[PDB]
Design a protein around this ligand. Structure first.
Ligand SMILES: Nc1nc2c(ncn2[C@@H]2O[C@@H]3COP(=O)(O)O[C@H]4[C@@H](O)[C@H](n5cnc6c(=O)[nH]c(N)nc65)O[C@@H]4COP(=O)(O)O[C@H]3[C@H]2O)c(=O)[nH]1
Length: 146
C-alpha cells in the first residue's frame, strides 16, 4: 500500500541507510570501492552482505519502479511472449507476461534502463522490478516450451 518513515531519496545509498539495511560504514565502503572498481554502488554494496531483494527494492524506490512480490503468482501468456523473445529478452533484460489497461506488462531486472526501453517502445507499458533469481526463472513461464 503506502510507506513512509522519514525516508530520503537524496541518494541510492542513503535510501538504504534510512531503512537501516546497511551500516553507515557499509555505504562509504561501497562508495569508495566504486571509485577504484568503477562498478555500480548497488552491486558493489552487495559485497558487504546485502540481500538482492534489498538492493533491488531500493532501486524501485529511487527509480519509482514497481517491484514484484514474486513470480510464481504472475500469469504469463502467449500474446505477451510475442513482444520479446527468449534471447531478445536478455538483450535488454526484460520479459513480457500480459497486458493491463491497454498497456504491455514487461518485467525487467534493470530499472536503471527502464527508461531506455520505455522510450524506445514508444507505447504504454508497465515496467516491474523483480529479483534476478525470480526474473530468470520467469523466462520459462513467459516462454513456455511447445
Ligand atoms: N555520498 C554518497 N554518494 C552516493 C550515495 N548513493 C549514491 N551516491 C553516489 O551518487 C551516484 C549516483 O547514484 P544514484 O543515487 O543517482 O543512483 C544509482 C542507481 O539508480 C543506479 N544503480 C546503482 N547501483 C545499482 C545496482 O546495483 N543495480 C542497478 N540496476 N542500478 C544501480 O545507478 C545510479 C548511479 O549511481 P552509482 O552507483 O553509479 O554512483 C552513485 C554514487 O557515486 C550515498 O548514499 N552517499
Amino acid at each position: 500500500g503506502s510507506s513512509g518513515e522519514g525516508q530520503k531519496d537524496l541518494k541510492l545509498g542513503e535510501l538504504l541507510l534510512q531503512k537501516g539495511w546497511i551500516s553507515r560504514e557499509a555505504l562509504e565502503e561501497a562508495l569508495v570501492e566504486q571509485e577504484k572498481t568503477g562498478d555500480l554502488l548497488g552491486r558493489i554494496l552487495v559485497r558487504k552482505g546485502l540481500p538482492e531483494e534489498a538492493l533491488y527494492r531500493a532501486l524501485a524506490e529511487q527509480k519509482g519502479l514497481e517491484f514484484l512480490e514474486s513470480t510464481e503468482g504472475i500469469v504469463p501468456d502467449p500474446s505477451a511472449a510475442l513482444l520479446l523473445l527468449r534471447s531478445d529478452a536478455l538483450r535488454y533484460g526484460a520479459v513480457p507476461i500480459g497486458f493491463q489497461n491497454g498497456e504491455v506488462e514487461v518485467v525487467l531486472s534493470d530499472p536503471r534502463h527502464k527508461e531506455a526501453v520505455a522510450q524506445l517502445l514508444n507505447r504504454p507499458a508497465r515496467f516491474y522490478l523483480a529479483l534476478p533469481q525470480a526474473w530468470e526463472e520467469l523466462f520459462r513461464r513467459a516462454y513456455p516450451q511447445k
